[PDB]
Design a protein around this ligand. Sequence first.
Ligand SMILES: Cc1cn([C@H]2C[C@H](O)[C@@H](COP(=O)(O)OP(=O)(O)[C@H](Cl)P(=O)(O)O)O2)c(=O)[nH]c1=O
Ligand SMILES: [Cl-]
Ligand SMILES: [Mg+2]
Ligand code: NA
Ligand code: NA
Ligand code: NA
Length: 326
Amino acid sequence: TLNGGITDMLTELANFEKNVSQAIHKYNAYRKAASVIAKYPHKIKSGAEAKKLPGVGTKILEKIDEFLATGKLRKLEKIRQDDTSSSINFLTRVSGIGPSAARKFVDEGIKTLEDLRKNEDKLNHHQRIGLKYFGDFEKRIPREEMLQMQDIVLNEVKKVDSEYIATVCGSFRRGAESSGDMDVLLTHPSFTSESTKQPKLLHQVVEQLQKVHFITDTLSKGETKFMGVCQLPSKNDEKEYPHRRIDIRLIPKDQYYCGVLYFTGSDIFNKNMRAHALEKGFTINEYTIRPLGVTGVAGEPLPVDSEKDIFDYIQWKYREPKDRSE
DNA sequence: CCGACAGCGCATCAGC
DNA sequence: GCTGATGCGC
DNA sequence: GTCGG
Ligand SMILES: Cc1cn([C@H]2C[C@H](O)[C@@H](COP(=O)(O)OP(=O)(O)[C@H](Cl)P(=O)(O)O)O2)c(=O)[nH]c1=O
Ligand SMILES: [Cl-]
Ligand SMILES: [Mg+2]
Ligand code: NA
Ligand code: NA
Ligand code: NA
């Protein structure tokens, strides 16, 4: 909140570069800048002060001086006024519509929520569901509701096979008082790095959650990753809860620590951590941490028996999930 | 000045 | 049908 | 857009 106006501005610029310019490096640069400023514990008085932070360079420094002087940025003011950019930006807020589809729809004169609804036949499945719950997916999930959803998912999973372990990750595991969605990491001893001893491991779980009407819709589904929609049950006479996004990722049981580090995030925390790993001569994914040879070619997986082990390898002090919200 | 910027699952398409 | 590129998502 | 080398 200390530098909320600045980080909002940068986020708006990031979104512009992603959705309209389709300049993903500019997008990621703006988000990095916004992140480093958000955790900076002083109210920023100048661009030069902000430029001391890594990730803030000359251009963002100048923007920050304008914003501090006047409370706005002319570049953003003009972007806001531009119909095509505003339209493109809006359409990407539908799950499954990205920068390319958004611009394509705008070209055909499909540029409002109303246009989308009347042109449902021109959407793929993911987009159609994204449009169906557009309102709901805008809403945050209070932590108290996340606790209920967790109870339901862990108990239902236990009913399918008591050897499943389901772990809620994402912002929830980072201790947030509200989340954008629910992220569930799933393991079963039958699925390891070495073998898949039984099939349908993800399916049976999804099927059980569909059976008790917790999962209501599917955006995408594969053997290890489910992306869909869920809803808490409501009591008699009470308004229904909003429909929520849910992600479920099944990871080899012996690779749980790399898996839970990944799915706990944040996304920018993962990006910084993995970038750092590279500078230290390692590569990290949701399965393994591996050394980089002289080549650049990845070596064999290093042994890992905790999240801290991964931090150790790259010479980072351990950071608790709650300090990983970047 | 220049190249690199994290790493990967699922849906959809062109080409064969 | 398969393989690889592309889009969108985590 | 930023930064290390
Ligand atoms: C989008 C993304 C996610 N992840 C990892 C790290 C992420 O933490 C994890 C879940 O993605 P999420 O989109 O649900 O992120 P979250 O942290 O739960 C969000 Cl603050 P919210 O859902 O509360 O709004 O996946 C990445 O490693 N790279 C990414 O680009
Ligand atoms: Cl770019
Ligand atoms: Mg989440
Ligand atoms: Na800087
Ligand atoms: Na979208
Ligand atoms: Na998610």
